């Protein structure tokens, strides 16, 4: 599944933000307007026993250039909140339930 790091507009958030996969489907963050972004799951707000880093950047990596990306596959069955770190204040959130 691809997720657009910044909407066709400008505005920042993940296009969709919201949605569902199967435990081992790529999702694919592309870099796409209003970059730099990355993409950190809040390790507070993943599947019990998930390991946070093996699945985000860290806060202080980015995806700088458009196009750039960043791929994860999810595992484990349940909801994982992600967010970009700096642009989490102004909305850009999401949340992908493995199913
Ligand atoms: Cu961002």
Redesign the pocket.
């Known amino acids: 599944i691809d997720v657009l790091?910044?909407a066709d507009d400008g505005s920042?958030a993940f296009v969709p933000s919201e949605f569902s996969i199967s435990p081992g489907e790529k999702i694919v963050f592309k870099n796409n307007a209003?970059f730099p972004?990355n993409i950190v799951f809040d390790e507070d707000s993943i599947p019990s026993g998930v390991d946070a880093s093996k699945i985000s950047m860290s806060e202080e990596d980015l995806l700088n250039a458009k196009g750039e990306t960043f791929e994860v596959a999810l595992s484990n069955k349940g909801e994982y909140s992600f967010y970009?770190s700096?642009?989490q204040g102004a909305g850009?959130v999401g949340k992908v339930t493995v199913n």
């Open positions: 790091l910044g920042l209003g972004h970009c700096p642009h850009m």
